UniProtKB/Swiss-Prot annotation, chain B:
This is Small ribosomal subunit protein uS17A. There are 2 genes for uS17 in yeast. Component of the small ribosomal subunit (SSU). Mature yeast ribosomes consist of a small (40S) and a large (60S) subunit. The 40S small subunit contains 1 molecule of ribosomal RNA (18S rRNA) and 33 different proteins (encoded by 57 genes). The large 60S subunit contains 3 rRNA molecules (25S, 5.8S and 5S rRNA) and 46 different proteins (encoded by 81 genes). Keywords: Acetylation, Cytoplasm, Isopeptide bond, Ribonucleoprotein, Ribosomal protein, RNA-binding, rRNA-binding, Ubl conjugation. One of its GO terms (molecular function) is structural constituent of ribosome. The keyword NAD does not apply. Belongs to the universal ribosomal protein uS17 family. There is a cross-link at K14, K45, K55, K56, K78, K95, K104, K132, K140, K147 (Glycyl lysine isopeptide (Lys-Gly) (interchain with G-Cter in ubiquitin)). One of its GO terms (cellular component) is 90S preribosome. Pfam families: Ribosomal_S17, Ribosomal_S17_N. N-terminally acetylated by acetyltransferase NatA. The gene is RPS11A. It comes from Saccharomyces cerevisiae (strain ATCC 204508 / S288c) (Baker's yeast).
Curated annotation (Swiss-Prot), chain C:
This is Small ribosomal subunit protein uS4A. The keyword rRNA processing applies. The chain holds residues 2 to 132 of 197 of the full protein. The lineage of its organism: Eukaryota, Fungi, Dikarya, Ascomycota, Saccharomycotina. Component of the ribosome, a large ribonucleoprotein complex responsible for the synthesis of proteins in the cell. The small ribosomal subunit (SSU) binds messenger RNAs (mRNAs) and translates the encoded message by selecting cognate aminoacyl-transfer RNA (tRNA) molecules. The large subunit (LSU) contains the ribosomal catalytic site termed the peptidyl transferase center (PTC), which catalyzes the formation of peptide bonds, thereby polymerizing the amino acids delivered by tRNAs into a polypeptide chain. Keywords: Cytoplasm, Isopeptide bond, Nucleus, Phosphoprotein, Ribonucleoprotein, Ribosomal protein, Ribosome biogenesis, RNA-binding, rRNA processing, rRNA-binding, Ubl conjugation. Belongs to the universal ribosomal protein uS4 family. It is found in: Cytoplasm; Nucleus, Nucleolus. One of its GO terms (molecular function) is structural constituent of ribosome. GO terms for cellular component: 90S preribosome; cytoplasm; cytosol; cytosolic small ribosomal subunit; nucleolus; nucleoplasm; small-subunit processome. One of its GO terms (biological process) is ribosomal small subunit biogenesis.
From Swiss-Prot, chain D:
The modification Phosphothreonine is found at T114. Its main location: cytoplasm. Present with 573 molecules/cell in log phase SD medium. There are 2 genes for eS4 in yeast. It comes from Saccharomyces cerevisiae (strain ATCC 204508 / S288c). Component of the small ribosomal subunit (SSU). Mature yeast ribosomes consist of a small (40S) and a large (60S) subunit. The 40S small subunit contains 1 molecule of ribosomal RNA (18S rRNA) and 33 different proteins (encoded by 57 genes). The large 60S subunit contains 3 rRNA molecules (25S, 5.8S and 5S rRNA) and 46 different proteins (encoded by 81 genes). This is Small ribosomal subunit protein eS4A. Component of the ribosome, a large ribonucleoprotein complex responsible for the synthesis of proteins in the cell. The small ribosomal subunit (SSU) binds messenger RNAs (mRNAs) and translates the encoded message by selecting cognate aminoacyl-transfer RNA (tRNA) molecules. The large subunit (LSU) contains the ribosomal catalytic site termed the peptidyl transferase center (PTC), which catalyzes the formation of peptide bonds, thereby polymerizing the amino acids delivered by tRNAs into a polypeptide chain.
Curated annotation (Swiss-Prot), chain E:
Present with 15900 molecules/cell in log phase SD medium. There are 2 genes for eS8 in yeast. This is Small ribosomal subunit protein eS8A. The keyword Ribosomal protein applies. It is found in: Cytoplasm. The gene is RPS8A. The lineage of its organism: Eukaryota, Fungi, Dikarya, Ascomycota, Saccharomycotina.
Amino acid sequence: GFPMKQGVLLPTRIKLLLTKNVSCYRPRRDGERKRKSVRGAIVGPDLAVLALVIVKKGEQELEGLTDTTVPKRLGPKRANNIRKFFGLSKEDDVRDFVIRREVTKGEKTYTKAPKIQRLVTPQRLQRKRHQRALKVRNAQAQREAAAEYAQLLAKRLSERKAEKAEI
Amino acid sequence: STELTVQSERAFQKQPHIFNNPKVKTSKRTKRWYKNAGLGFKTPKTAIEGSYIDKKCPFTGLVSIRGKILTGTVVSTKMHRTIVIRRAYLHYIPKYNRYEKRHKNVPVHVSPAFRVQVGDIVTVGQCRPISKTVRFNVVKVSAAAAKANKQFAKF
Amino acid sequence: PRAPRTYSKTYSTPKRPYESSRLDAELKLAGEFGLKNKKEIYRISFQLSKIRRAARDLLTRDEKDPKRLFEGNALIRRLVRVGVLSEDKKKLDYVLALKVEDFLERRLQTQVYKLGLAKSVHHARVLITQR
Amino acid sequence: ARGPKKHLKRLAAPHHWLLDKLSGCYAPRPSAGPHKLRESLPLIVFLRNRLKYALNGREVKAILMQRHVKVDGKVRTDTTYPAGFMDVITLDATNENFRLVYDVKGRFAVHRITDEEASYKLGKVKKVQLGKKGVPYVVTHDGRTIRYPDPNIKVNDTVKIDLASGKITDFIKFDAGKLVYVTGGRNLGRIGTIVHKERHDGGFDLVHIKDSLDNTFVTRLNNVFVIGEQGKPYISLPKGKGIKLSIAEERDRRRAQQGL
Amino acid sequence: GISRDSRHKRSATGAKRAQFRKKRKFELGRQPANTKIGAKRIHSVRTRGGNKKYRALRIETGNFSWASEGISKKTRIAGVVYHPSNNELVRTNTLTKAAIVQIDATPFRQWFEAHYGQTLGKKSKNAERKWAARAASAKIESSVESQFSAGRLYACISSRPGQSGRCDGYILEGEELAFYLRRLTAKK
RNA sequence: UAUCUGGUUGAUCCUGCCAGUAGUCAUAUGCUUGUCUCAAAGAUUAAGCCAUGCAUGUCUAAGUAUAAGCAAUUUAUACAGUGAAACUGCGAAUGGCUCAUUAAAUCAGUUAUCGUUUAUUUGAUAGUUCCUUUACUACAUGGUAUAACUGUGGUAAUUCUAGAGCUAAUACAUGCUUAAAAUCUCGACCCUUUGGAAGAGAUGUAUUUAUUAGAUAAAAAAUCAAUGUCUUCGGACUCUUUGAUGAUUCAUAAUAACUUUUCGAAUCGCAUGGCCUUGUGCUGGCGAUGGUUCAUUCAAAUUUCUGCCCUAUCAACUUUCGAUGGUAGGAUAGUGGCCUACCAUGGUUUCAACGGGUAACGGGGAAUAAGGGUUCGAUUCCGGAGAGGGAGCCUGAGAAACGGCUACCA
RNA sequence: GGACUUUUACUUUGAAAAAAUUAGAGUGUUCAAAGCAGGCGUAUUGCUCGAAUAUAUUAGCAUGGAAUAAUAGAAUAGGACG
RNA sequence: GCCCGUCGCUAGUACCGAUUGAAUGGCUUAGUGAGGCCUCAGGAUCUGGGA
Ligand SMILES: [Mg+2]
Ligand SMILES: [Mg+2]
Ligand SMILES: [Mg+2]
Ligand SMILES: [Mg+2]
Ligand SMILES: [Mg+2]
Ligand SMILES: [Mg+2]
Ligand SMILES: [Mg+2]
Ligand SMILES: [Mg+2]
Ligand SMILES: [Mg+2]
Ligand SMILES: [Mg+2]
Ligand SMILES: [Mg+2]
Ligand SMILES: [Mg+2]
Ligand SMILES: [Mg+2]
Ligand SMILES: [Mg+2]
Ligand SMILES: [Mg+2]
Ligand SMILES: [Mg+2]
Ligand SMILES: [Mg+2]
Ligand SMILES: [Mg+2]
Ligand SMILES: [Mg+2]
Ligand SMILES: [Mg+2]
Ligand SMILES: [Mg+2]
Ligand SMILES: [Mg+2]
Ligand SMILES: [Mg+2]
Ligand SMILES: [Mg+2]
Ligand SMILES: [Mg+2]
Ligand SMILES: [Mg+2]
Ligand SMILES: [Mg+2]
Ligand SMILES: [Mg+2]
Ligand SMILES: [Mg+2]
Ligand SMILES: [Mg+2]
Ligand SMILES: [Mg+2]
Ligand SMILES: [Mg+2]
Ligand SMILES: [Mg+2]
Ligand SMILES: [Mg+2]
Ligand SMILES: [Mg+2]
């Protein structure tokens, strides 16, 4: 039951060090690597199962395959992705193009659409408006307290020359 | 210790970031830098008049004296630019109510602003780890030679 | 990982195990105050012992020394408090004197008998231990 | 040993907390904050062990989470938040203000203070460097960064602070003859004006103190906290005014007060 | 890996010390970048507490400054020509601090002539002003002018390429240039 | 709390040991054993080996919900309650255990960092991001590729997982922006003077290098090269600005550039209001999570002075293969023979080096009570070290981690 | 602020100084070993004392002392003051 | 009277000693050398020179 691993070549087994983001391994812990057996990527008579994908459909239909067609479980949830799974232009408004999945509660048939993320909304612009506003507001305040200190030094200098003219 | 040559290494010796502009015609060739180490230790004139380089010099170099200040009498000047002194002292054993003579040798860097010989008493100052063993830098000679010229010939 | 729960012992044994004279003198104390143990005597003579040490130690410092006056007074008043020390000899060269029976004379055992109410040191015990 | 320690064993905890030996095995380890570990009173100890206001620790969290309690103004929701000298604990309910200021035995006393004295605190400046962009700053024993302070202000000076806003409204220079609170050593909690300071280039300037009972003593300059003028302090001092009486003196005061 | 403890290593008496504890990672050392010349290739390395260090292995350009002219240009790095620590660095043309290199001159040329209007070796309005303003200042220096004919300038690397991913330095000048000039040929 | 007694002789006085005597937070064992409280306890020998169970996980209004989940009601046709799974984030470096190693090591007291790293807490801190700069750059917000899931599977077997098909973000990867001004270099033109100019670019922070300012030890002049501001056109310059430390090439700033370019909010929760030229315009409340730099706090790492048991049936030791110093680099978080090159011949020792032994972790302390001492400390607190033995390392702020991985040995 | 200073031992006071332990104060855990409590009233709406002190030495620091014991100084004058 | 040594018995202890005897533990020459890390290459596939 050991699995193949693309690009090992060899028609045998070996034991590799495996990491995150790699086939035939799911790390149990941050920065963990486990040393595991692996089967080669070259088909031999020892394989219990060969995994195969259809790329061109031959002259005849294969029962449970061409003849049946299974729908894609989930639909588009991010803003522009709906816009691309329908081709809409940032004009058409998504909210009515989000997909809707019906279901029944025995005698209550319900409806539940996603939750469009990265949607541009009035709320979000108030936060953009706010950031900039704070940045600039601070910026001026920071000049003020600065210039206030220039003064605190300017009429401190002319106090060391009102002192240097007393004696 | 140093003496002579000064430019005697494979690399060029220079105080770091002390540029002398060749364009600007000067009467001293090398612009020199120094400080006063503090704690009232006269930065002797030989360190200002000097031409030596020693980066581990307390007056011309990039060390810094902070911490223990100690004295001891020079017992070894065979190492180039570093000496070894003996700090003697009496250690008290309570049961007998008496002390015994003990001693320790502390190795210490000595800048070619000083001319030390064996037997000279020397006030050293603690600095940063300067080598495997040396944690001190000679900072004043409270000696001279111990009356050497009063050992000349006959009448 | 806790705080050491502290203890210490409250009695002391005699150096010499079979001194016929100390032995008599000891029983007689029990016979008189209704004790059950030589320990009950060992206990006190030990208390007494340290008190004297405290008193000796204090007596070697100079007269009107701060610790002496503080720790001296404290010792004396506490002794008076339980009625061991005489009002007159309230200056710790009689705490230095003192003796065991001056301590024995103040056990509830002994008071509960002294003003009647028991009429025997033993009946005194039994009454006390019986609530 | 491998990283930050997160626990505090009872007995390792500072003494002036007046924690008790048994009833557990740990003490609350003071959060990282404004005051050093070993010179602080965490909120749990003050709310519970001083004020007796909660019984359980678990109750102390329930109290704070309502945001009753506010240090220096801000609301503070950290069971072991490191409160410390010169701060202002406030209970919004019970209309109650406190200041953390020392005993004479060296302990943080409960000390009730006015509703308006509670709107500022004192801070010893611990350093004054020239920060980024040429802007000079001071930093105070309780870790506050205050930009653009008075030039005349330098290290060891104390400083009155708004709380309400960040700013410095006044400072007191470290001169011979200024009211001093002692924050450290055995002489911790004593108060006494200043005689003169031993210099000692290289480390540990000594500061000679004399109080209002013409008794004298010394500490390290580090341990000296300016708080005002002979007579005139700048905060209300806890009763006994940090004068420190002999054990005999204190005995007598306590066994003179007796006639029930 | 590489340790930097002192706890191996005999005591100053010469005594042999037992092993107490194992290698900690905070006394760790890592291997030399041994950087060479050509086609930018740098590898970041994760050093204590976040803190990247940049390990240059192969560099072809660095930022070099002519101190007495107070400018800095970015030139190719031609070669390593002298190194006080170890000759193998020179022969394998390895970049490290202290290394003596040769760079390009033609950026320090294009600046000079466009600023002095004099040209090394061998008509605008304001330019003539500024050019004439300068000089009695255009005197350069023989041992530096010569090098331009060759189109290569001697320079001492001043950065730490294994540390910072930069191979930077200053042109050689006056006193210190004479030092290496002497060493160059009186070894050649 | 300053005490001795029995035993050599025919008897005697001595020397002198054996014996007695008492304590032991000092172990075992025997016999005996009723009550309150207190409560040490697989250290010693075997840091020998271990069945099985448990000892690290974690969610707020506030990162991610189309559960083909539960709930239904109560306004919600994008979402909205509640919420498994999973992703993301944080923690797992604390704690607890043990005393094998360790004899100038650890550890203690006392120092140093002007020799560094520091998640976090607390406090400060960011108008500069684009581009030959009128036919313009998503800002009303740019990219996919994945878990969970669905379905197809493989193995005797595990916290094994494979092929297929989906889909999120505070995961991954991108990428716009904002005032006034001042100073710099270029310089189209005009004109000879003593000379001046439209207008063109550049200038956030961080990185790397080089250069400069960072004065002050009491006062004055002349001249060279550049070149500032004010003319009562020979001339003058008059007020002239300076932080800290015992001490710095310090803090901070300035010039020329450098960068596979660090940071500069494409985030979330509650409220919904002002304001007219009625655009769903332009604004705008409270606080979360972020974010660079500095400070602070929890830290760490090294580090100065002095101090260890027995041993000479250990007297010379140290440099094979760094031993002691110098120069340069490299490496590090950073000093440093830490490592490498080159060069030198140093370093320690009867004041006991070096070697050996320890049935040796160090300290606070414990037992014995005239005093001086003697003996003990695996073990409730602090420090250190380890996880069967060694080494290696990944993650991370922090491990050379073992209830993490990798290898060898057992 | 400048300009310079023979070295030490001893002793005095003082700083800096963990807690538990120890010595020791206060408090009737019923006593006690302990513990750091507790004590008063209007016991219906709080009053209040506490949680000391000492030891803590050898080394380092800081200060007073100038006996005792060392060290150094001026003799080929290369002496001392101006 | 005391008393010394060989010689003889029983029992116990330590020594010397062929076996170039044995065992444990600590270092360590030379040879062989796992593994991760760094590094020169590599390029199953997968995109805009990089992965
Ligand atoms: Mg979103
Ligand atoms: Mg030498
Ligand atoms: Mg805590
Ligand atoms: Mg200091
Ligand atoms: Mg390499
Ligand atoms: Mg006999
Ligand atoms: Mg007889
Ligand atoms: Mg006879
Ligand atoms: Mg005996
Ligand atoms: Mg065991
Ligand atoms: Mg045990
Ligand atoms: Mg839902
Ligand atoms: Mg631990
Ligand atoms: Mg992709
Ligand atoms: Mg991110
Ligand atoms: Mg000047
Ligand atoms: Mg200054
Ligand atoms: Mg700097
Ligand atoms: Mg509205
Ligand atoms: Mg032997
Ligand atoms: Mg070296
Ligand atoms: Mg030799
Ligand atoms: Mg000996
Ligand atoms: Mg051992
Ligand atoms: Mg121990
Ligand atoms: Mg021991
Ligand atoms: Mg053991
Ligand atoms: Mg460990
Ligand atoms: Mg085991
Ligand atoms: Mg080995
Ligand atoms: Mg391990
Ligand atoms: Mg385990
Ligand atoms: Mg663990
Ligand atoms: Mg003392
Ligand atoms: Mg105490």
